[PDB]
Amino acid sequence: KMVVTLVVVTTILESPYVMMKKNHEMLEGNERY
Secondary structure: OOOOOOOOOOOOOEOOOEOOOOOOOOOOHHHHO
């Protein structure tokens, strides 16, 4: 075929600031918290 030619945000689990979700093991990304 055609061949070519050549922000880290840290935190800690504290209520009510950052808490675990219900389906935290069933979801991924930034929606886990």
